């Protein structure tokens, strides 16, 4: 791959597109003011799905020279426009009229199917150019570093709204068609082609004015303007936040957020015209959830952050796309946390991007964040959950290492320097290094140019009133000690806190050595020491036995912040699974979480204990670990109770469902008895139970029920009114324990009553229900492999079916059985999932064989 010759660079695009609806085509003429930087006889542009009618170049004050040479290269999406004579150095005007297609590929200038408040089914002209689809709406230099200004014009019917990046400056009628009106927009600033936007359709709107004076609007489908009210007030507060943080005003005169029906791209940060899918921007009061207002605040703060970082200053090449999305993925939580501190959104960030990035970065076949991108198709291949989640995680670690003071100063220097220009990743490290005086380029190179993350071991010794800390770093791997003689090293900024001040740093350090000693002044032995305050650093911490015991009071009295309790517990399970520490040591810490009120912490607690419970189901003391789970969740269960208390939040309803389902599955007698009261009153029409208690009650009564209970659930499903009620049953049907009922659920998955896209959910619940239910699900998909393969081959479902079925196995002999099965019955699209699952089975197998009897003897001694 090679970029455009750059012998002719654009200056201003004058576009006028007439979307031919019903015919699904469009015609448009382009007057591109350009500069000939080097004498050439041909101009090379990007173009796809567009046939040029005629094209001529008119130099300044001269006659136009029509092009008599056309060359369409579809594999490279580039077109060469040859001319009879050399164009010579100077300024000219490239005039190109052409015709295009409103394709069905949800890319470029395509058609968007929407339904009126009555029906009829109409189509709209919606745009989407990122990454390289602007060349399908009009021929252009479709590269982010080739910036120019845009004069957008649209010839739309009178009864249809035409939006674009800028505001409307003229609305004159169309002479050839009385039913059409040409809408001309203002001139955009210097920007990239992949951020240009224009949409044609029928939309209602709600408007407001931000404190900066910027006109904010939320465009909704016809008849849903009230649903975009919340997104409007969030966007109206988001602009002043980024204005104050960047010390740079909003670069455009107006901001628009339009909700589109079935918007495939999800969300696009088009400069001034941010597009969403209505299921992610609007809040339907009779269909939305509880945390929907939280999800809207995040998606609005993310794309509006790009209006500065990404649109005002754009990446030089797609190699730096991770930094554009990683920065926005981090500052979106900073914006929501400032406007809505009642969310404690940073605890959910650690539970989302942070932990998910540490899972992938600790396994084999990982890759560094920044990878050189040659062809723009290589993007879709080498960027994944690693480049974005770990990308946002290292930015958070960098912000904490810099400090919010110098970080704001460096970003203002960065934005003002490269405004309406382009920059690379190294340009950002320089602007931050100038404002902070810290070696940012050197530190960040260890986190971007190599894969993996370090494990920080810390040991404590009391020296007078101070405490000496001995730190060492090594590459962390989910399997254990990293085998390899390269010995990776990281420059690790570490924030340390003590019990005397658990919410602010006791000491900030930078570990640029494999081993390092640290002295904390005035730290009494009765005080605990916590590394990685706020879990801001992208690393795992292994505490010594003495240091871990000192942290137990901090967990119990909640003085340790919830985000710290989340990260501490998550590190303990990973270290025990890797064989670095014992599992018994982790189980003793679980007893200190009995006072935990935070939903996110319990969510990760329940997830980790669920992995261990299903792992220990292969042993002869599965009753002992269930009794242990009941003791951990009993106090929080009694605190929440069964009915919503006066003035609860939305997380307390979610936490009640998680806790009750955990106790119900573990056999908690009081929970099982009450769940049967609610279920028998729900099926007899005496009092329908809440939708929040519905899933835990179903799981509990079905696991501890019989064939009568299963028939009731099947009657609730075949009679279920909506699809949502069906899915809530399909996930819990696998909780049955009797073998003939398990086979009945598996057969029910492939029946006509279950839709094929939901069949994997039913079989997934069977594999996760019990040990014999997992073996029955694995045998079921082997006997019916011909049908299941024909159903989901080459799709996402076949990888999800294999994942949910075999990941729970804890026998190393079983890992060799799934690898041998897919060597005789190939599944090409799921080749990567089989390798991850086989490595995961061997990991759980070694973990089980190493710690089985130690856990057993711990549970017996604890009970006495
Ligand atoms: Zn983004």
Short mmCIF file of N, CA and C in Angstrom, two decimals, residues 544-647:
data_model
loop_
_atom_site.label_atom_id
_atom_site.label_comp_id
_atom_site.label_asym_id
_atom_site.label_seq_id
_atom_site.Cartn_x
_atom_site.Cartn_y
_atom_site.Cartn_z
N UNK A 544 2.57 -9.26 50.17
CA UNK A 544 3.04 -10.32 51.05
C UNK A 544 1.92 -10.73 52.00
N UNK A 545 2.11 -11.87 52.66
CA UNK A 545 1.10 -12.37 53.58
C UNK A 545 0.83 -11.37 54.70
N UNK A 546 1.88 -10.72 55.20
CA UNK A 546 1.70 -9.75 56.27
C UNK A 546 0.95 -8.51 55.78
N UNK A 547 1.31 -8.01 54.59
CA UNK A 547 0.65 -6.82 54.07
C UNK A 547 -0.82 -7.09 53.74
N UNK A 548 -1.12 -8.29 53.23
CA UNK A 548 -2.50 -8.62 52.90
C UNK A 548 -3.37 -8.67 54.15
N UNK A 549 -2.85 -9.25 55.23
CA UNK A 549 -3.61 -9.29 56.48
C UNK A 549 -3.84 -7.89 57.04
N UNK A 550 -2.90 -6.97 56.83
CA UNK A 550 -3.09 -5.60 57.29
C UNK A 550 -4.23 -4.91 56.55
N UNK A 551 -4.48 -5.30 55.30
CA UNK A 551 -5.53 -4.69 54.50
C UNK A 551 -6.93 -5.18 54.87
N UNK A 552 -7.03 -6.30 55.58
CA UNK A 552 -8.34 -6.87 55.91
C UNK A 552 -9.23 -5.90 56.69
N UNK A 553 -8.75 -5.19 57.72
CA UNK A 553 -9.63 -4.20 58.37
C UNK A 553 -10.12 -3.12 57.42
N UNK A 554 -9.26 -2.66 56.50
CA UNK A 554 -9.68 -1.65 55.55
C UNK A 554 -10.83 -2.11 54.66
N UNK A 555 -10.86 -3.40 54.32
CA UNK A 555 -11.99 -3.94 53.58
C UNK A 555 -13.22 -3.99 54.47
N UNK A 556 -13.05 -4.40 55.73
CA UNK A 556 -14.20 -4.66 56.60
C UNK A 556 -14.88 -3.36 57.02
N UNK A 557 -14.11 -2.33 57.37
CA UNK A 557 -14.69 -1.06 57.79
C UNK A 557 -14.93 -0.11 56.62
N UNK A 558 -14.72 -0.57 55.38
CA UNK A 558 -14.98 0.17 54.15
C UNK A 558 -14.11 1.42 54.01
N UNK A 559 -13.08 1.58 54.84
CA UNK A 559 -12.18 2.72 54.68
C UNK A 559 -11.40 2.63 53.38
N UNK A 560 -11.10 1.42 52.92
CA UNK A 560 -10.51 1.25 51.60
C UNK A 560 -11.56 1.59 50.54
N UNK A 561 -11.26 2.48 49.60
CA UNK A 561 -12.29 2.94 48.67
C UNK A 561 -12.81 1.79 47.83
N UNK A 562 -14.06 1.89 47.35
CA UNK A 562 -14.65 0.75 46.62
C UNK A 562 -13.87 0.34 45.38
N UNK A 563 -13.28 1.29 44.67
CA UNK A 563 -12.49 0.94 43.49
C UNK A 563 -11.23 0.19 43.90
N UNK A 564 -10.70 0.47 45.09
CA UNK A 564 -9.53 -0.27 45.57
C UNK A 564 -9.92 -1.68 46.01
N UNK A 565 -11.07 -1.82 46.68
CA UNK A 565 -11.54 -3.15 47.06
C UNK A 565 -11.84 -3.99 45.82
N UNK A 566 -12.32 -3.35 44.75
CA UNK A 566 -12.58 -4.06 43.51
C UNK A 566 -11.29 -4.61 42.91
N UNK A 567 -10.27 -3.76 42.80
CA UNK A 567 -9.02 -4.20 42.19
C UNK A 567 -8.26 -5.20 43.05
N UNK A 568 -8.31 -5.03 44.37
CA UNK A 568 -7.61 -5.94 45.26
C UNK A 568 -8.17 -7.35 45.15
N UNK A 569 -9.50 -7.48 45.18
CA UNK A 569 -10.12 -8.79 45.05
C UNK A 569 -9.86 -9.39 43.68
N UNK A 570 -9.89 -8.57 42.63
CA UNK A 570 -9.68 -9.08 41.28
C UNK A 570 -8.25 -9.58 41.09
N UNK A 571 -7.28 -8.92 41.73
CA UNK A 571 -5.90 -9.37 41.63
C UNK A 571 -5.69 -10.69 42.37
N UNK A 572 -6.37 -10.87 43.50
CA UNK A 572 -6.17 -12.08 44.30
C UNK A 572 -6.61 -13.33 43.55
N UNK A 573 -7.73 -13.25 42.83
CA UNK A 573 -8.21 -14.42 42.09
C UNK A 573 -7.28 -14.74 40.92
N UNK A 574 -6.76 -13.71 40.24
CA UNK A 574 -5.84 -13.95 39.13
C UNK A 574 -4.54 -14.58 39.63
N UNK A 575 -4.03 -14.10 40.76
CA UNK A 575 -2.78 -14.64 41.29
C UNK A 575 -2.96 -16.07 41.78
N UNK A 576 -4.09 -16.36 42.43
CA UNK A 576 -4.35 -17.72 42.88
C UNK A 576 -4.53 -18.67 41.69
N UNK A 577 -5.24 -18.22 40.66
CA UNK A 577 -5.41 -19.03 39.46
C UNK A 577 -4.08 -19.27 38.76
N UNK A 578 -3.17 -18.29 38.80
CA UNK A 578 -1.86 -18.43 38.19
C UNK A 578 -0.88 -19.23 39.04
N UNK A 579 -1.28 -19.65 40.24
CA UNK A 579 -0.39 -20.38 41.11
C UNK A 579 0.62 -19.54 41.85
N UNK A 580 0.52 -18.21 41.77
CA UNK A 580 1.47 -17.34 42.46
C UNK A 580 1.16 -17.29 43.95
N UNK A 581 -0.12 -17.28 44.31
CA UNK A 581 -0.56 -17.40 45.70
C UNK A 581 -1.54 -18.56 45.79
N UNK A 582 -1.86 -18.94 47.02
CA UNK A 582 -2.78 -20.04 47.25
C UNK A 582 -4.23 -19.55 47.19
N UNK A 583 -5.12 -20.46 46.81
CA UNK A 583 -6.54 -20.12 46.77
C UNK A 583 -7.11 -19.96 48.17
N UNK A 584 -6.61 -20.74 49.13
CA UNK A 584 -7.07 -20.62 50.52
C UNK A 584 -6.85 -19.21 51.04
N UNK A 585 -5.72 -18.60 50.68
CA UNK A 585 -5.45 -17.23 51.10
C UNK A 585 -6.48 -16.26 50.54
N UNK A 586 -6.99 -16.52 49.34
CA UNK A 586 -8.02 -15.66 48.77
C UNK A 586 -9.35 -15.88 49.48
N UNK A 587 -9.67 -17.14 49.81
CA UNK A 587 -10.93 -17.43 50.48
C UNK A 587 -11.01 -16.77 51.85
N UNK A 588 -9.88 -16.63 52.54
CA UNK A 588 -9.89 -15.97 53.85
C UNK A 588 -10.18 -14.48 53.72
N UNK A 589 -9.87 -13.88 52.57
CA UNK A 589 -10.17 -12.47 52.36
C UNK A 589 -11.65 -12.26 52.06
N UNK A 590 -12.31 -13.26 51.46
CA UNK A 590 -13.73 -13.12 51.12
C UNK A 590 -14.58 -12.86 52.36
N UNK A 591 -14.15 -13.35 53.52
CA UNK A 591 -14.92 -13.15 54.74
C UNK A 591 -14.89 -11.69 55.21
N UNK A 592 -13.94 -10.89 54.71
CA UNK A 592 -13.89 -9.48 55.05
C UNK A 592 -14.81 -8.62 54.20
N UNK A 593 -15.43 -9.20 53.16
CA UNK A 593 -16.34 -8.47 52.28
C UNK A 593 -17.80 -8.56 52.73
N UNK A 594 -18.06 -9.10 53.92
CA UNK A 594 -19.44 -9.30 54.36
C UNK A 594 -20.20 -7.99 54.51
N UNK A 595 -19.49 -6.87 54.66
CA UNK A 595 -20.11 -5.56 54.80
C UNK A 595 -20.11 -4.77 53.49
N UNK A 596 -19.84 -5.42 52.37
CA UNK A 596 -19.70 -4.71 51.10
C UNK A 596 -21.05 -4.19 50.63
N UNK A 597 -21.18 -2.89 50.35
CA UNK A 597 -22.45 -2.36 49.85
C UNK A 597 -22.46 -2.10 48.35
N UNK A 598 -21.28 -2.04 47.74
CA UNK A 598 -21.17 -1.61 46.35
C UNK A 598 -21.59 -2.73 45.40
N UNK A 599 -22.41 -2.38 44.40
CA UNK A 599 -22.91 -3.38 43.46
C UNK A 599 -21.80 -3.88 42.53
N UNK A 600 -20.94 -2.97 42.06
CA UNK A 600 -19.89 -3.37 41.13
C UNK A 600 -18.91 -4.34 41.78
N UNK A 601 -18.59 -4.12 43.06
CA UNK A 601 -17.69 -5.02 43.76
C UNK A 601 -18.32 -6.40 43.91
N UNK A 602 -19.60 -6.45 44.29
CA UNK A 602 -20.27 -7.74 44.42
C UNK A 602 -20.40 -8.43 43.07
N UNK A 603 -20.60 -7.65 42.00
CA UNK A 603 -20.69 -8.23 40.66
C UNK A 603 -19.42 -8.98 40.30
N UNK A 604 -18.26 -8.37 40.56
CA UNK A 604 -16.99 -9.06 40.32
C UNK A 604 -16.73 -10.14 41.35
N UNK A 605 -17.16 -9.92 42.60
CA UNK A 605 -17.07 -10.98 43.61
C UNK A 605 -17.88 -12.19 43.20
N UNK A 606 -19.13 -11.97 42.79
CA UNK A 606 -19.98 -13.08 42.38
C UNK A 606 -19.41 -13.79 41.16
N UNK A 607 -18.81 -13.04 40.24
CA UNK A 607 -18.25 -13.64 39.03
C UNK A 607 -17.05 -14.53 39.36
N UNK A 608 -16.13 -14.02 40.19
CA UNK A 608 -14.95 -14.81 40.56
C UNK A 608 -15.33 -16.04 41.36
N UNK A 609 -16.24 -15.90 42.34
CA UNK A 609 -16.66 -17.05 43.12
C UNK A 609 -17.44 -18.05 42.28
N UNK A 610 -18.15 -17.57 41.26
CA UNK A 610 -18.84 -18.49 40.36
C UNK A 610 -17.87 -19.34 39.56
N UNK A 611 -16.76 -18.74 39.11
CA UNK A 611 -15.73 -19.51 38.42
C UNK A 611 -15.16 -20.58 39.34
N UNK A 612 -14.91 -20.22 40.60
CA UNK A 612 -14.35 -21.18 41.54
C UNK A 612 -15.36 -22.27 41.89
N UNK A 613 -16.63 -21.90 42.07
CA UNK A 613 -17.65 -22.88 42.42
C UNK A 613 -17.81 -23.93 41.33
N UNK A 614 -17.93 -23.48 40.07
CA UNK A 614 -18.03 -24.43 38.97
C UNK A 614 -16.74 -25.23 38.81
N UNK A 615 -15.60 -24.64 39.14
CA UNK A 615 -14.34 -25.38 39.12
C UNK A 615 -14.35 -26.48 40.18
N UNK A 616 -14.75 -26.14 41.40
CA UNK A 616 -14.79 -27.11 42.49
C UNK A 616 -15.97 -28.06 42.40
N UNK A 617 -16.82 -27.93 41.37
CA UNK A 617 -17.87 -28.92 41.15
C UNK A 617 -17.31 -30.24 40.65
N UNK A 618 -16.07 -30.24 40.15
CA UNK A 618 -15.40 -31.46 39.74
C UNK A 618 -14.86 -32.26 40.92
N UNK A 619 -14.99 -31.76 42.14
CA UNK A 619 -14.46 -32.41 43.32
C UNK A 619 -15.58 -33.09 44.10
N UNK A 620 -15.22 -33.69 45.23
CA UNK A 620 -16.16 -34.42 46.07
C UNK A 620 -16.64 -33.59 47.26
N UNK A 621 -16.40 -32.28 47.25
CA UNK A 621 -16.83 -31.40 48.34
C UNK A 621 -17.52 -30.15 47.80
N UNK A 622 -18.25 -30.29 46.70
CA UNK A 622 -18.97 -29.15 46.13
C UNK A 622 -19.99 -28.59 47.11
N UNK A 623 -20.48 -29.41 48.04
CA UNK A 623 -21.35 -28.91 49.10
C UNK A 623 -20.61 -27.94 50.01
N UNK A 624 -19.30 -28.15 50.21
CA UNK A 624 -18.55 -27.32 51.15
C UNK A 624 -18.32 -25.92 50.60
N UNK A 625 -18.10 -25.80 49.29
CA UNK A 625 -17.90 -24.48 48.71
C UNK A 625 -19.23 -23.74 48.59
N UNK A 626 -20.33 -24.46 48.39
CA UNK A 626 -21.64 -23.82 48.38
C UNK A 626 -21.98 -23.26 49.76
N UNK A 627 -21.65 -24.01 50.82
CA UNK A 627 -21.84 -23.50 52.17
C UNK A 627 -20.97 -22.27 52.41
N UNK A 628 -19.78 -22.23 51.82
CA UNK A 628 -18.92 -21.06 51.95
C UNK A 628 -19.51 -19.85 51.25
N UNK A 629 -20.09 -20.06 50.06
CA UNK A 629 -20.70 -18.95 49.32
C UNK A 629 -21.88 -18.38 50.10
N UNK A 630 -22.67 -19.26 50.74
CA UNK A 630 -23.82 -18.79 51.51
C UNK A 630 -23.38 -17.88 52.66
N UNK A 631 -22.28 -18.22 53.32
CA UNK A 631 -21.80 -17.39 54.43
C UNK A 631 -21.34 -16.02 53.95
N UNK A 632 -20.84 -15.93 52.72
CA UNK A 632 -20.34 -14.65 52.22
C UNK A 632 -21.50 -13.74 51.82
N UNK A 633 -22.55 -14.31 51.23
CA UNK A 633 -23.67 -13.53 50.71
C UNK A 633 -24.84 -13.42 51.68
N UNK A 634 -24.81 -14.13 52.80
CA UNK A 634 -25.92 -14.04 53.75
C UNK A 634 -26.09 -12.64 54.35
N UNK A 635 -25.04 -11.99 54.89
CA UNK A 635 -25.28 -10.67 55.51
C UNK A 635 -25.78 -9.62 54.53
N UNK A 636 -25.20 -9.55 53.33
CA UNK A 636 -25.70 -8.59 52.34
C UNK A 636 -27.10 -8.97 51.89
N UNK A 637 -27.42 -10.27 51.90
CA UNK A 637 -28.77 -10.69 51.54
C UNK A 637 -29.81 -10.21 52.54
N UNK A 638 -29.52 -10.33 53.83
CA UNK A 638 -30.46 -9.86 54.84
C UNK A 638 -30.56 -8.34 54.86
N UNK A 639 -29.47 -7.64 54.55
CA UNK A 639 -29.51 -6.18 54.50
C UNK A 639 -30.42 -5.69 53.39
N UNK A 640 -30.33 -6.30 52.20
CA UNK A 640 -31.15 -5.85 51.08
C UNK A 640 -32.60 -6.31 51.24
N UNK A 641 -32.80 -7.53 51.73
CA UNK A 641 -34.13 -8.08 51.82
C UNK A 641 -34.69 -8.42 50.45
N UNK A 642 -36.00 -8.61 50.42
CA UNK A 642 -36.70 -8.97 49.20
C UNK A 642 -37.48 -7.82 48.57
N UNK A 643 -37.98 -6.90 49.37
CA UNK A 643 -38.76 -5.83 48.76
C UNK A 643 -37.96 -4.53 48.71
N UNK A 644 -38.20 -3.70 47.70
CA UNK A 644 -37.50 -2.41 47.62
C UNK A 644 -37.85 -1.52 48.81
N UNK A 645 -36.81 -0.97 49.43
CA UNK A 645 -36.96 -0.11 50.59
C UNK A 645 -37.20 1.33 50.15
N UNK A 646 -37.79 2.16 51.02
CA UNK A 646 -38.14 3.53 50.61
C UNK A 646 -36.91 4.35 50.27
N UNK A 647 -36.83 4.76 49.01
CA UNK A 647 -35.76 5.63 48.56
C UNK A 647 -34.52 4.89 48.09
#
